[PDB]
């Protein structure tokens, strides 16, 4: 696929090339062809590589945001579970030793 900005600038240098070919002779651009197709192919190929990078970038950014959110929720659950554990620890040990001082009475 040919990109439209490269196609438009290609059309600009096409009508310029037609002007120089019709104006003087046929050896005006005989040393200009494999330079200019290399430059235009460079722009097209790098723009296509940019196009691939954009879509893979949006995919990994999206599931990055999802992973960040789910990890934050996992942090909340872990901290809540540890707090509930240490609370139940202290409360049950508290009334247990209240039971053994009641035993010693």
């Amino acid at each position: 696929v040919m990109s439209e900005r490269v196609s438009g600038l290609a059309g600009s240098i096409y009508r310029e090339f037609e002007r120089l070919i019709h104006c003087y002779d046929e050896e005006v651009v005989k040393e200009l062809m494999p330079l200019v197709v290399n430059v235009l192919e460079n722009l097209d190929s790098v723009l296509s590589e940019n196009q691939e990078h954009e879509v893979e970038l949006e995919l990994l950014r999206e599931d990055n945001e999802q992973l960040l959110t789910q990890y934050e929720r996992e942090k909340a659950l872990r901290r809540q579970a540890e707090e509930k554990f240490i609370e139940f620890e202290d409360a049950l040990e508290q009334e247990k030793k209240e039971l053994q001082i009641q035993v010693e009475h």
Binding site: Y14, F17, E26, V29, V36, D44
Partner: peptide, 13 residues
């Protein structure tokens, strides 16, 4: 992209 400038050139040579 070769073909098009190629036509450019051979179209009258």
């Amino acid at each position: 992209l070769a073909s098009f400038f190629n036509s450019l050139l051979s179209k009258k040579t």
